[PDB]
């Protein structure tokens, strides 16, 4: 394998000889297998499991728990340190297991959308994985292709390849196939970059770690992800709650020291309270909910590249899709030709093949029989950068349709008959592309410039037209009839292109129009209907004509009989405020460049909406990045979009977007359930100890009982609320506001109700057992079991904010059931197991005592259920 520098200095023939690369046919099966035996695959070795495990310990709240455990160790309290450590381990282990499951499910799904490229091996071009490439293989680069390996380019008709991912310069760099003597490798196409424009062909000069810039990719694989905005918000909320609780515990410290109490016991109980009130499971339950959401969309065939989409899919209301590649299957075909002379040709046959005959008044046309159609097809063929190799398109679908037309009429070969010295390439802003050329056989002729594009931009440059093989000055009547034909073609759904040829730009001859049918994608009508029925708006943003976009949108259904459509030039004319007013009304935007698409995206975002742009094509990647959610197609998506996208639809269905939005809704409710449960029982414990200290009663709970309660309210019993299934009614709710607003006033009121009930009942039992003025171990055991059963019933109420418990069923959430069973078993063992009675300072209770405590603890669940029925009746 050669280095990039050596391959750059070495000419094409020497590099081919060194690698034994057959440029025109490529490597056969045996040679590829033999080279794979030595060099192996193109994978960058292997990807930090223990590093991932230790990463979770860096959270601020886990660090606070570790600090509390260290304080317990130094001021030696073995049992407290062990309990706090076990709490840390169980919560961090739950987080690690869920993260591992989510990441492995994502990897399994991404295996179904692997990196790929076009490779000619047996003289037949094939779609093969970049993994399978071996040195010396022939690789063909198209527009919007990821370079599968370092390539020695021996063909570059036109080529702009961005180097932002490797170099850092966003400007595309043009490539020249000639050798370069001595980032500046103008002829080498490095691994992993993206081809902005044109076509090329090269021989791979490296595999695996031999790539010149593989270290940046190794860093990208290890770059990790910044925390989600919800994750940052909940880190902030956890810090706020912990600091409020720390202030409260400081007040308890001062009261206990001033009134007079054992200072060591005060320190231990305050450490247990601080560990309890710290919501250690809040970032963990957030991460668990996000992970489970990721697995839920992976089950729906949606590769979620970036985690912050999961918080955002529940808020989505507007989808700014594209006509070409997203709402249409992108299998274009030229079907109708209107010549400048007025003659009309019906092209038949479908797909990118030469099998199809152009019919002109019922008479088949081949070669140069009809000069007008022949020049139309010649300008179509010469001006493209697309090739049909072995019935597989490489370039753009519209260019592919033009090539298929040329092969159908038998004029494909003219593409080899012209030398493209100068090229004005296609850009979405320009809406046209032109190439200057000189005939190979007859160099004496002038530099004929072929041109194609949209009608308006093309005809602006044209100053002449064809009539019976004669060039005549263009007139307004000719423009009017051509415009009428364009409008009717677009009303038929045919995508229209205008073709021209002449000397120099601005002096061209208008040859005719071509009607490209691109049928709508199957199943998108039903998906669009379900999306509007589910309170989700859809907008068609395009660079195409009004008639084509409106006809296709009316076919799909997002453009009803009475709907508004706005041009891009209008959007330029309108101000920002007027644009914000009118944007929700418009159903179909047309002739909108990528700048106008970004303008519309930013306007819809300015209206408080969460925009999910489902795009395709090289120039629309910036708009995908601009949108809140950038969706891409799986089986019909360029690597530029899939790299720039944020979600990928593996099976290419719009129903996947509705499914993902459905899965993204319920994370908010589950996290609210955890927040209410943990905050309510922590406030209960804090208030109980505060009342015990202030009124000088004995503390109803000691340090280890509070630590067990902390394990309950932050361990599996509370983390199972994050696993709770999502009901159907929340899906019917409109999109969640982008503002978090987790601590809702209703949530705080229910929290205070639960805390007050818990404190009242627990203090009632404590006073009832303490009436005899003897602080028995039975008193502490009764109070502790009362609080723990209170906590379990609080969790049972906390499973759902609105939906009743009985309708859900006790077995609906199996993790919650197992956690509650384990909590009850641990409670009984603490009551009965004589070592655990010694460590927790408890005494065995009678059966009737447990029955009375269970009856008392039913009160909080009954009150919560009655409250739920009250709001359910009020809402109706």
């Amino acid at each position: 394998v050669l280095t990039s520098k050596k391959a750059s200095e070495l000419p094409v023939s020497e590099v081919a000889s060194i690698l034994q690369a057959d440029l025109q046919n490529g490597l056969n099966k045996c040679e590829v297998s033999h080279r794979r035996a030595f060099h192996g695959w193109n994978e960058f070795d292997i990807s930090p499991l223990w590093k991932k495990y230790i990463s979770q310990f860096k959270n601020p709240l886990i660090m606070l728990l570790l600090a509390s455990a260290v304080i317990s160790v130094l001021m030696h309290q073995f049992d407290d340190a062990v309990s706090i450590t076990v709490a840390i381990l169980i919560v961090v282990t739950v987080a690690f297991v869920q993260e591992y499951r989510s990441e492995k499910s994502l990897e399994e799904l991404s295996k179904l959308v692997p990196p790929e490229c076009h490779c000619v091996r047996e003289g037949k071009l094939e779609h093969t994985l970049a993994r399978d490439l071996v040195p010396g293989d022939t690789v063909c680069l198209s527009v919007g292709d990821r370079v599968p390996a370092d390539l020695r380019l021996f063909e570059a008709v036109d080529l702009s390849i961005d180097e932002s991912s490797l170099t850092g310069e966003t400007t595309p760099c043009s490539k020249v196939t000639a050798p370069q003597p001595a980032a500046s490798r103008s002829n080498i196409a490095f691994m992993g970059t993206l081809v902005r424009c044109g076509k090329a062909k090269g021989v791979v000069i490296g595999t695996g770690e031999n790539s010149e810039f593989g270290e940046v990719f190794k860093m990208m694989q290890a770059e990790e992800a910044p925390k989600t905005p919800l994750q940052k918000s909940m880190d902030l909320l956890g810090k706020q709650l912990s600091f409020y609780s720390f202030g409260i515990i400081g007040i308890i410290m001062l009261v206990g020291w001033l009134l007079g109490k054992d200072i060591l016991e005060m320190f231990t109980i305050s450490v247990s309270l601080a560990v309890a009130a710290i919501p250690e499971g809040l970032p963990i339950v957030v991460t668990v909910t996000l992970a489970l959401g990721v697995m839920r969309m992976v089950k729906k065939r949606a590769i979620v590249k970036k985690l912050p989409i999961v918080e955002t899919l529940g808020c989505c209301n507007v989808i700014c899709s594209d006509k070409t590649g997203t709402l249409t299957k992108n299998e274009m075909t030229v079907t109708h030709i209107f010549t400048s002379d007025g003659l009309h040709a019906e092209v038949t046959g479908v797909g990118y093949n030469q099998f199809g005959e152009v019919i002109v008044d019922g008479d088949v046309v081949h070669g140069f029989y009809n000069p007008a159609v022949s020049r139309i097809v010649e300008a179509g063929c010469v001006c493209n950068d697309a090739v049909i190799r072995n019935n597989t398109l490489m370039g753009k679908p519209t260019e592919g349709a033009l090539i298929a037309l040329a092969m159908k009429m038998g004029l494909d070969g003219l593409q080899q008959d012209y030398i493209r010295k100068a090229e004005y390439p296609f850009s979405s802003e320009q809406k046209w592309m032109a190439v200057k050329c000189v005939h190979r056989t007859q160099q004496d002729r002038p530099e004929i410039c072929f041109m194609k594009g949209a009608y308006e931009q093309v005809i602006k440059y044209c100053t002449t037209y064809q009539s019976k093989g004669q060039t005549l000055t263009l007139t307004q009547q000719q423009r009017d009839v051509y415009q009428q034909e364009k409008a009717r073609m677009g009303s038929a759904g045919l995508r229209v292109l205008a073709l021209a040829s002449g000397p120099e730009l601005g002096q061209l001859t208008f040859l005719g129009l071509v009607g490209i049918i691109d049928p709508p994608r199957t199943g998108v009508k039903e998906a669009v209907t379900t999306l509007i029925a589910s309170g989700v708006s859809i907008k068609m943003i395009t660079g195409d004509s009004q008639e084509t976009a409106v006809a296709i949108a009316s076919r799909l259904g997002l453009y009803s009989k009475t709907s508004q459509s706005v041009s891009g030039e209008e959007i330029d004319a309108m101000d920002v405020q007027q644009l914000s007013q009118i944007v929700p009304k418009v159903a179909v935007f047309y002739r909108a460049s990528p700048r106008h698409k970004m303008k519309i995206i930013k306007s819809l975002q300015k209206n408080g909406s969460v925009v999910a742009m489902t795009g395709d094509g090289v120039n629309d990647a910036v708009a995908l990045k601009a949108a809140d959610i950038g969706v891409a197609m799986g089986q019909t998506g360029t690597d530029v979009c899939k790299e720039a996208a944020d979600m990928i639809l593996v099976d290419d269905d719009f129903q996947t977007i509705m499914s993902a939005i459905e899965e993204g809704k319920g994370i908010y409710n589950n996290i609210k359930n955890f927040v209410r449960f943990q905050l309510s029982t922590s406030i209960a414990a804090l208030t109980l100890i505060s009342l015990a200290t202030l009124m000088n009663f004995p503390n109803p709970l000691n340090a280890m009982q509070i630590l067990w309660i902390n394990i309950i309210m932050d361990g599996p019993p509370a983390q199972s609320l994050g696993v709770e299934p999502v009901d159907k009614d929340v899906i019917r709710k409109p999109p969640r506001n982008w503002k978090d607003s987790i601590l809702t006033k209703n949530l705080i009121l229910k929290i205070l109700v639960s805390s007050i009930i818990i404190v009242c009942g627990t203090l009632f039992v404590f006073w009832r057992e303490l009436r005899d003025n003897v602080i028995t171990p039975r008193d502490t055991t009764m109070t502790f079991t009362c609080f723990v059963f209170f906590d379990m019933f609080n969790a049972l109420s906390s499973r759902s904010q609105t939906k009743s418990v009985f309708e859900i069923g006790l077995c609906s959430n199996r993790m919650f059931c197992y956690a509650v069973l384990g909590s009850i078993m641990g409670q009984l063992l603490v009551i009965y197991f004589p070592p655990l009675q010694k460590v927790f300072q408890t005494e065995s209770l009678s059966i009737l005592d447990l029955l009375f405590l269970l009856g008392l603890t039913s009160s909080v669940c009954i009150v919560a259920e009655i409250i739920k029925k009250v709001e359910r009746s009020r809402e109706k």
Partner: nanobody
Amino acid sequence: QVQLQESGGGLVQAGGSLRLSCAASGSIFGADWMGWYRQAPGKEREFVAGIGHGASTYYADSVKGRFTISRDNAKNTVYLQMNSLKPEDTAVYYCAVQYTQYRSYDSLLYWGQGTQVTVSS
């Protein structure tokens, strides 16, 4: 309007012979273009065989010399013979028809539901 129906597909062994038929409700006279198309998983649909306006028959390169297509007005059903079939040239087959067409631009493209052909080594 013309309605298309496909029949004859089924499991077939290598080296055998296979029959397929695509029948339209109307008579097969005016359609300049009509042909089968091989669609398979993991690839785009590909041409099989068809007939043009001037009685010239088009065959795909991969299956040239072994696929034969015929048409008859009496039975109004276009009829396909396959021989020397391989495991690598089997997938679902869709028969398609196009009628010649002036002021409109609506394509007279009609497709069949499709019949699956499976092969094993």
